[PDB]
Design a protein around this ligand. Sequence first.
Ligand SMILES: C/C(=C\C(=O)OCCCCCCCCC(=O)O)C[C@@H]1OC[C@H](C[C@@H]2O[C@H]2[C@@H](C)[C@H](C)O)[C@@H](O)[C@H]1O
Ligand SMILES: [K+]
Ligand SMILES: [Mg+2]
Ligand SMILES: [Mg+2]
Ligand SMILES: [Mg+2]
Ligand SMILES: [Mg+2]
Ligand SMILES: [Mg+2]
Ligand SMILES: [Mg+2]
Ligand SMILES: [Mg+2]
Ligand SMILES: [Mg+2]
Ligand SMILES: [Mg+2]
Ligand SMILES: [Mg+2]
Ligand SMILES: [Zn+2]
Ligand SMILES: [Zn+2]
Length: 917
Amino acid sequence: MDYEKTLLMPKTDFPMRGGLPNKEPQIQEKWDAEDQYHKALEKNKGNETFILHDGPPYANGNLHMGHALNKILKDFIVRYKTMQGFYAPYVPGWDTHGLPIEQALTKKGVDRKKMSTAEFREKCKEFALEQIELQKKDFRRLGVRGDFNDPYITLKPEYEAAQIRIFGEMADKGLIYKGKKPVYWSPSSESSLAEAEIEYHDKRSASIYVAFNVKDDKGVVDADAKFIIWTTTPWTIPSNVAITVHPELKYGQYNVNGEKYIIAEALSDAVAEALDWDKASIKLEKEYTGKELEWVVAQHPFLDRESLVINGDHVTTDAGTGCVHTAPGHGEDDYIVGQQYELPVISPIDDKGVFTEEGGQFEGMFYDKANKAVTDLLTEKGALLKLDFITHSYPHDWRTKKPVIFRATPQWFASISKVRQDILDAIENTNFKVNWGKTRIYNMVRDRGEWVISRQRVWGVPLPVFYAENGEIIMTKETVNHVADLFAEHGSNIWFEREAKDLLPEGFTHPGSPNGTFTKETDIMDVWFDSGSSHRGVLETRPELSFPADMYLEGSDQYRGWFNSSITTSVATRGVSPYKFLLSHGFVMDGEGKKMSKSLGNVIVPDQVVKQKGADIARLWVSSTDYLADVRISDEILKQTSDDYRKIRNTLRFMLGNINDFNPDTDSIPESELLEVDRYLLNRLREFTASTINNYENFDYLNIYQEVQNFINVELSNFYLDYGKDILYIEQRDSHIRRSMQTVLYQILVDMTKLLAPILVHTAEEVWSHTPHVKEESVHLADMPKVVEVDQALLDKWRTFMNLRDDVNRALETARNEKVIGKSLEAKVTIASNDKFNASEFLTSFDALHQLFIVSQVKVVDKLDDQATAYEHGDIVIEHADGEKCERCWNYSEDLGAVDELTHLCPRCQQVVKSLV
RNA sequence: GGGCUUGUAGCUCAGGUGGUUAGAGCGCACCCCUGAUAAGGGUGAGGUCGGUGGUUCAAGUCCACUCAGGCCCAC
Ligand SMILES: C/C(=C\C(=O)OCCCCCCCCC(=O)O)C[C@@H]1OC[C@H](C[C@@H]2O[C@H]2[C@@H](C)[C@H](C)O)[C@@H](O)[C@H]1O
Ligand SMILES: [K+]
Ligand SMILES: [Mg+2]
Ligand SMILES: [Mg+2]
Ligand SMILES: [Mg+2]
Ligand SMILES: [Mg+2]
Ligand SMILES: [Mg+2]
Ligand SMILES: [Mg+2]
Ligand SMILES: [Mg+2]
Ligand SMILES: [Mg+2]
Ligand SMILES: [Mg+2]
Ligand SMILES: [Mg+2]
Ligand SMILES: [Zn+2]
Ligand SMILES: [Zn+2]
C-alpha cells in the first residue's frame, strides 16, 4: 500500500512564488478600506508620541529612487514605533510653489501674458494638485502608511498664513530688511532672469587693460606704482569700486620701466607676456605682499574722485590677470566681498540697455556700442591700454538669443548674521546618528552669507509688505498679521486679486500718503522659505502633531536645503531646533557607485521595481543598504534582493504548513516540558529577537537584513526545519514530541513575521492571513514580541554541539563521495573523545543523536583505533547503517514489521500507524 | 579650489584600544535527495583589504600623499 497517506505533510495555500505585483495592490486596497492609518493611531491613543516630520517633496515630475529610499526608511521608523505602542502620526506633505512649475505650464503652452496673474496662478495650482495625485499614487504603491488622504500642502490657506506669521515675527525681531543685489538682466525682455532662462552663446567683447595709478598716500605704503586693470566690459568701468587680493598669496613685482606696477606669482609669466612688454624681460625687485595690501587707498583716474580699496578674496588667480577691480553694480561675488565696507552702489541703466545718471556723454544710448567706441574715449589716454577683440561664451536670453548683463535690483534679505550664533547653539544641542552630520550643517550655518528671500515671480507666497508714498516700508505686526488673517481665510490669491487698501486693516492710516493711498510689494518668497516653515504650518497647526519633531529624515542635499531653512526659521522665531534628532541618508547610485544618468542607461526607477518585482522587494533592498552613505542599485543587486526574498518567503511557507493543525490555545507544550533541542531554538529566537529590536532602536536595518538571513538559512532551513521532518511528518499528530516542536515553530513563525512587518509589509500581512489563531487582524496592528533574557549556557552548549555537527557532516561528506552512503539516513555514526575534544562525555547530555544528525544510528564509544579520522570535536567513523529501510520514515531498522497491508515499518512507525486505522 | 563623505572576496555587509593562515549570508562549483519539488541537504573554491610611501618588531586598523567616486558650494 501507500505510506505517504499515513504521513503528516505540510498544508497551506500560501504560495511559494510571491506574485507581488498582483497581490500587493489587493492588500493595500484592504488596508485603506479598513482605514488602518487612523486605526493604528487610535490603537496607541494615549501613549507616548513619536513625531517624524515629512520634508515636502516637490509637486512636479516622477518619483525617483531617492523618494523611494527616503519614504521607505520613514515608514520603517513609524511602523516600528507604532508597533511599540507609540502614537506616531505620519503626515506627508507637498511643496507646490516655485519657478519649475511656472515653467512646466509655460512649456505646456499656457502663456502668462494672455490671462493675468490670478488666472495663471490658478493654472499653477491645478497643475500642482494633478502632480500630487500621481505622486501620492506611487508613494502608496510602496506600501507606505501615512495621512495620504489629508496631506499638508504649501498652497493651503492655513499653511500660507503660518508662513506669513513667520515672516512677521522675523521682521519684528529686526531680521528682515530691504537692500539690493546684482541679477541677470535682459534688456531685450526688460526683465530679470533666473539661470533657467539663460543659455550661452559666443559674443564679441572688446577686452582692454586700464592700468590705474596709486596716488593718495594712505596707499603709498609701498611706492606709487600703479595698479593695472582688465575688464571685458567697457561699461563696467564707470563703477569705481575697490580692487582685489587673495589673502596668503602675495607678490607685487615692481619691475623696471613703465611704472613698476603689480602682477603676481603664478601670474607674472602669463601676464606681461601679453602686455606686449618684454624690454629685456626686466627682472623684478621689491614685490610687496599681495594679501596684506588692504586699504591701499588708490585713486582710479578716468575721471574718478574716490580711491578703491582691497579686501580678502575667494577665487581670483588664473589666466585672468592678477588685476581684477570691482564694481558691485554689476557683479555676483563682486558684490559680496564688495559691500562689507562703505561702498556706494554703482551704475544706472533702466529695464532697457539705456542709462542716465553719472553717464557722461552717454546719457541715453545703450550698454553696447556706447562702449566699444564711445566709452573707449576714457582708456589708454592716461591708463595705458590695449583695445582687443576676443570671443568667449557669454550669458544670453534663451528666448531672444540676445545678451544678458548684471544689474543691481532691490531684493529682500533675512539676517542670518544676527541669528547665526543662535542657530549654531541649537545645532550643538541637536542629536545626530553620526557626528559628521553635526559638523556639516554647523560649518554650513557658520560660513553662510545673508539669505535672499525674494523672487520677482508670481507663483508663491507674497511678501506681506505695503508701501506708503512719501518713503515706503509698512511692515508692522498689525499689517502682517491682518494679511495672515486674510490668507488663512482666502489663501495667497487674495493678494493678487485685491488692491492695497483692501489688504490693509480697519481703514488703516499712516503718516505717509496724506491721501490714505497705499502701494503693495509684488515679490514672492523663495520656496526654501515655504518648506522651511513647515514646522509652523504643520507641526504647530495640526492637532495630531507637536512642534518639536522627534526627527527630520532626508537626503544629504538637505543640509543646505530643508534642514537649513527649517532650523534657521525655527530658531529665529522659536529659539529652538524644529527637530530633536537629525538623520540623513545618501543618494542612490548605480552598481558602480556612479550617478544614474539616462545617456548611460543605468537609471532604474521606483515604478519599475514595483511593477516588475514588487514593493516588498524595493523595501528589502532599502533595508540592505548602508544608507548613511550613498547606496547602490542595479539589476544584479536586485536579483540578489529577489533571491533573499524568495528564501525568507519559502522558509515562512514551510513553517506555516507545519503548524496548520496546531492550536496554540490547546496543544502547546509548557517550556519546562519541551525537548531540549526545542528549548534551544526557543532561545535562539529570543536572542534574535533581542538583537533585532536593538537594531530597530538604532535605525540599523542593514544589521537586520544580515541577521534575518543567517537566522533563516542556518538555524532554521539548514538545521531545525530539516531535522524536524523526521518528527513533524512521522510522529503521531498529537504526540508530545511533535507538539513540542510545533509549540516553538509557531512562536518563531508569529514573532518573526511581526519582527519583519515594518519591512516586508505585504508579505508579513499575507503570512499573518495564513496563520491560525492569531488574535488581531493585520500584523501591522499587533505589538512587537517582548524582549526576554536568553539562557546563555544552553546557547554555548548547543553552539558547541553545532560545531560538532559540522565535523560529522564533513565525515558524512567524505563517506558520501565514496558512495558508501547516499542520503545521511543510510549512515551509522560512531564517534569518540579525542585529544582535542571529550566527545564521549559531551555527547552524553543529548537525546536522539540519530535524529539530530539526520542519520539512522549514532554510537558513542569512548575510543577508536587508528582507522577513525580525527576532528576538532573527536574521532569519527562512518559506515552504512544497519538493518533495512523503513518504507515510512526512511530510517534504517533491524526490526521492520508489517501493520496490515503496510510492510517494512520500523517499531516506531508501526505504533504511529496502529494509532491511525 | 572649499566643507562633509565613500572605496574589504562575484553581490550586500562584519572586522573595539594595530598582533597567528581577514569573517558572514547570498551567489557560484561539485555532490546528495526527490515526502517543502519553478523546493530541500551537504562539501568546496573565491578577497591581502583602491594605489604608493611611511610610523612600528608588527597595520585592513595609525600618518602622509595619491586615484576613482558622492552631496553641496566656489563656478
Ligand atoms: C536621495 C536623493 C536623491 C537621489 O538619490 O537621486 C536619485 C537619482 C535621480 C534619478 C536620475 C534621473 C536621470 C537624470 C539625468 O539624466 O541626469 C534626495 C532626496 O530625495 C528624496 C526627498 C525629496 C524632496 O523634495 C525634497 C525636500 C526635502 C525639500 C523640501 O525640497 C528628499 O529626502 C531629498 O533629500
Ligand atoms: K528531496
Ligand atoms: Mg552594519
Ligand atoms: Mg542555504
Ligand atoms: Mg571592492
Ligand atoms: Mg564590494
Ligand atoms: Mg561598511
Ligand atoms: Mg559558500
Ligand atoms: Mg594590493
Ligand atoms: Mg609597510
Ligand atoms: Mg623600521
Ligand atoms: Mg583590529
Ligand atoms: Zn550660439
Ligand atoms: Zn519508520
